Design a protein around this ligand. Sequence first.
Ligand SMILES: O=C1CC[C@H](c2ccccc2)N1Nc1ncnc2[nH]c3cc(F)ccc3c12
Length: 167
Amino acid sequence: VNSFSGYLKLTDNVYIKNADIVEEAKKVKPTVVVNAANVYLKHGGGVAGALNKATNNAMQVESDDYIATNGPLKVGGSCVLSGHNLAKHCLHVVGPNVNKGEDIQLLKSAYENFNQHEVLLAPLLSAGIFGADPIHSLRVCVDTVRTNVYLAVFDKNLYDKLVSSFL
Ligand SMILES: O=C1CC[C@H](c2ccccc2)N1Nc1ncnc2[nH]c3cc(F)ccc3c12
């Protein structure tokens, strides 16, 4: 048992809710919140901009030191950093950005990072401003992640479409 509330169960291990991931994280304080990161960990907008804003920019300060030491992430890759006031840890995962021409095939590699964590609160990777089809992202998530994932979908119309179209 865990403290996630109000989720619809899609599969043995995947759950989904219409929720603002920032407010969800603040309430639950999960062990792991996933960020929709880019390779430079520049949290400007989308999920990343919202999560970083909620940390009063501490996520960005930490991220800038990480990049100065380690260089950029790979598309499809990840790193574990602090969750600040939102979670124990933040798993920054880079899904492909279709609006940059990045290979959508890398979405499966991106979701594979979730399997290193027993339980996660997450957005749909490559959705939103990353330009991929969220229905596809949900399918890849269900077919790739084997650990317990709680998906927060900000947009109510999209959430309803994802549920109603789920196979
Ligand atoms: O709901 C959906 C459908 C997919 C889309 C998405 C876009 C970018 C990254 C990851 C997912 N997206 N966005 C969010 N999903 C969950 N919590 C969110 N908090 C936010 C706060 C904001 F200022 C802006 C957006 C969100 C947001």
